[PDB]
Amino acid sequence: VEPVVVIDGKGHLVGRLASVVAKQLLNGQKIVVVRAEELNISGEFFRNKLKYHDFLRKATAFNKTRGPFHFRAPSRIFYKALRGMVSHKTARGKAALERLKVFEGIPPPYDKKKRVVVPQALRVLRLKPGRKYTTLGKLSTSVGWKYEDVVAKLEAKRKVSSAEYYAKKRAFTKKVASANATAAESDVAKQLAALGY
């Protein structure tokens, strides 16, 4: 219903999240993804690394400059997976891909904006307990993503700022709840309670 929706990549499955995002985009829904470095992929780390290496070998046989770029950033890797799901070689696919945006971490102004999750894509919810899983950040670091440390400091600063904001909001909401409780027992309150509120 919202004009724009922000999805937190942390604790989400790459395949299911990408599929749902692609399906929503084709229906005219703006979607943006944050904290892509925290995305997770099923299976053990070595299996995921071997699978990624298989895609790396693919390229233009004779001209080793125009082949598909083997992006290292986690956001670019996530976008590549979604690319194969959408009809890239079509006008509709290109139009849908424009609405989609993926960034590592939570850059502004999306940091102040609300974030949501996909219940049918949570790794912790759908993946059985104990099953081996791989974090996209580790794979990105192992495949030459020399930016994990940089993202960590910004993420920590944003987390501290958000914690301070949440503390202020909790302080305000405690007073709001106290005032609401004090206002109880009023005739309007009784009518609201009797009318489903």
Partner: protein, 350 residues
Amino acid sequence: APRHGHLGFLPRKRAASIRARVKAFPKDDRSKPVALTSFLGYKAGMTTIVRDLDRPGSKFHKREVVEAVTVVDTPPVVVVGVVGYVETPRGLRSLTTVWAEHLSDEVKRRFYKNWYKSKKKAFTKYSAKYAQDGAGIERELARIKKYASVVRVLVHTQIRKTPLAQKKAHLAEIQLNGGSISEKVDWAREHFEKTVAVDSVFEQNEMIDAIAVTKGHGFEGKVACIGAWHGQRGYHSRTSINHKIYRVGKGDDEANGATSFDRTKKTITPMGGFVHYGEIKNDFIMVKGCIPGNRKRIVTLRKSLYTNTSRKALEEVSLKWIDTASKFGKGRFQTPAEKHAFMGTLKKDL
């Protein structure tokens, strides 16, 4: 078998600029004072130095040896501004730039192209903002203090002071090795318009690396077995490392060429002058080996990006004599006095 070069150096298209941009800078050691990471200058020419070395275990230990050395012109330099960068997922991004407003005509000419036809509408307009009690440059300093964890200083070469007369100077960024960026920015602000001494950034026996553009050779575009069934040479940026500095050339005074052994009072200026170059009259750096490019080509000096503990770097030079014979032909004398002594008086003398 090997191939016609290195595949990592191909393709080999022409360089985008004559000045070799610095690809990386040495790690910022906070504990060290606020020094300078690199330097820029123009190489004059080549010369031969004869000296002994203290190399125990070597065949030529304690024996005099002659090694190829080069002289690079590096007159005094003045800082013109400071640049700060912030780490981002996209990489280091320039936050803001500052200028002293006391910019010489050299940088103005460099900024413009047709200076003679230019109206000379220099930074004066922006400088008018700075030409006050301040609070603007203070704001820039505060912005670069709260952010911009890495700071690169901007300096320009004294092209007018170079022996090869010219009006347009080069501009490039240089990093700092000092402590927290607070000290870096404070030192940069204090050193605005202040002269920079080459000797303060280097020392004898220091190992340095340099980057330059090799000599161009024009278009350089047989076996009919290349493809299976199932065009330029030179004028490109090149890097070289592990260059030993033999002596810092204080070319603003005599006795630089002569060593403590020979003490043959004279300058390093080769008899007649360097080929296609002027007559050194300012500070310079003596470095062994060779550097890409030719005379009058801008070069950059860097301290290898890391400290080396090898005995080769630790070993100190013992310069005994420096060759300065005329490079314009088969030179035979170092100074006109020797030529006069050999040939005696001449028709021109009487």
